[PDB]
Amino acid sequence: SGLVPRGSHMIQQIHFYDIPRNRDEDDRTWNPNTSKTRLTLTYKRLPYKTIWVEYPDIERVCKEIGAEPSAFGLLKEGKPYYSLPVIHDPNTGTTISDSIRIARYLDKTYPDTPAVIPAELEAFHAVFEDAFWDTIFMPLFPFLVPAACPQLNPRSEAYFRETREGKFGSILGGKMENWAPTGPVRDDRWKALQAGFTKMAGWLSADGQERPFFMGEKLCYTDIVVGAWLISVKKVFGSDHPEWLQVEKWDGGRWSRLVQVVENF
Amino acid sequence: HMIQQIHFYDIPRNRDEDDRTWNPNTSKTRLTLTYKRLPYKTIWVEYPDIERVCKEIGAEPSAFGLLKEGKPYYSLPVIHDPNTGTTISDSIRIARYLDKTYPDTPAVIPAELEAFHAVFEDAFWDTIFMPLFPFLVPAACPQLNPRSEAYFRETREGKFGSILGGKMENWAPTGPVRDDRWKALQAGFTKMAGWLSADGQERPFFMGEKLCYTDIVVGAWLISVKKVFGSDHPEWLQVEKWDGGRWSRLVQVVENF
Ligand SMILES: [Ca+2]
């Protein structure tokens, strides 16, 4: 046999860096920000593999593989902040951090996949992230963060508790157990979360219709962001948790429907 | 292209005709009309007469419960278009009406913008309107005609006075309180400029090269501040330099419609 192999030109698995929790492999993913990138990859039907990184190791892994910090000063007033998601794409040798920069890279590098963040979305999506921070993220924080924290592996649980209580504990009542304890405090915070999702639903129905996605019939990155936060809540709380089952009935079922979309990527 | 003038309902202030307009919300519609090059005449309505004027001409209320819980809320701007016999309230609904009725004018609110512009109005509310309120409202109030001054002061102090120090004079008095609030306002404009520069470039309008209704909204708020404070006021002169001159450039655009 004078036969030898010729190289394949199939797209190689992108290296996707994700934060595990204390579960077996198939239920290990949970994080809302890394879910943005995982959903972008699967929507584009790009191949990937997951490398698990615990919270206290993220900076050293990022420096090892050449990922830039995602911002400067979220925890330390004068120090860069390294976060996941990160991808290293061996097809090009490029490492990218921050889910928006990853989305742009994937649009640019794989133009035959469905585009997620065209230039005409960039400013309005930036507006959305700031509106979302105030009307969803901050009301959701006292729910998602205390639920996820004890699910983490011990090294991540300690880091996550210390940094998140360190950041927002003082305006949520102290330690996580006092942020939304079952009873009137949780109920008051729950009403605020429900009100935020209804305000966001109101954005989507502003024209008196019920478009499925912000642009109309076509999904884009900002739908993926909303879907990533919802998938995180569902994965952390559990699909039969009564509080998740309430969310499924919020705003005419709009968030159930979006979850069904992104789950079927 | 020969039409009758559109009737534009606007709120005066205590000045002669050519300087009577000032309001940020009615400026949204005035700018939309001028951008589309549609002829209009202005009918002046003082704040306490807006409801009865709206009911007389058939204008819908623009919100429900903003002043008292179970009570429709009427506001200006309103247009009545005699070319169709239609009266329209709320500047977003007026912009949609003008887009659809005059399709050969530049579209300002296409369907693909509607959700993102609604997002923007809420982000703008927190980022710009709230820090702007203690400056614009106390500056505008004494410029109003007496019947509007009393109404404006009573309604705006009743709604925001408790969280701002009570009477308007306590909202941003010259001294450290005004300094703190003025820095907060500049911080909000920088956040809004950061939206426009989010991709690392410096697009002139939210969508890129093409202006849309949400640029008109920001320009309407800027023109209101400039008209109220005065074009030589040292606080307005600072706004012209904020964020590398972005807001002075936008003002130049909308003034040039
Ligand atoms: Ca589950």
d(CA B62, CA B102): 23
Residue of A nearest to B192 (CA): A127
Q: Where are the domains of chain B?
A: 1-109, 110-257
Contact present, A217 and B115 (Cβ < 8 Å): no
d(CA A154, CA A15): 25
Contact present, A72 and A85 (Cβ < 8 Å): no
Task: Provide the resolution (angstroms).
Answer: 2.0
Contact present, A14 and A87 (Cβ < 8 Å): yes
Of the candidates B208, B55, B194, B222, which has an alpha carbon nearest to the alpha carbon of residue B123? Answer: B194
Contact present, A13 and A82 (Cβ < 8 Å): no
Per CATH, A1-117 and A118-265 having the same topology is answered no
H and E: helices and strands count for chain A: 10, 6
CATH of domain A118-265: 1.20.1050.10
For domain B1-109, the CATH architecture is: 3-Layer(aba) Sandwich (3.40)
When scoring A101, A105, A128, A130 by the number of chain B Cβ atoms within 10 A, the one with the most, hence best to mutate, is A130
Contact present, B226 and B132 (Cβ < 8 Å): no
Q: Which helix (H) or strand (E) holds A231?
A: helix A221-237
Instruction: Identify which of A119, A127, A204 has the shortest CB distance to residue B120.
Output: A127
CATH of domain B110-257: 1.20.1050.10
Token readout for A248 is 């499924």
Residue of B nearest to A120 (CA): B207
Which residues of chain A have a CB within 8 Å of the CB of B126?
A: 131, 134
Interface of A with B in 192-221 (CB under 8 A): 199, 202-204, 206-207, 211, 214-216
d(CA B183, CA B80): 41
d(CA B124, CA B37): 27
CA dihedral A84, A90, A91, A95 (to 10 degrees): 40
Instruction: Identify which of A124, A130, A199 has the shortest CB distance to residue B116.
Output: A124
What technique determined this structure? X-ray
**Candidates 3.40.30.10, 3.40.50.300, 3.10.129.10, 3.40.50.620; CATH matching A1-117:** 3.40.30.10
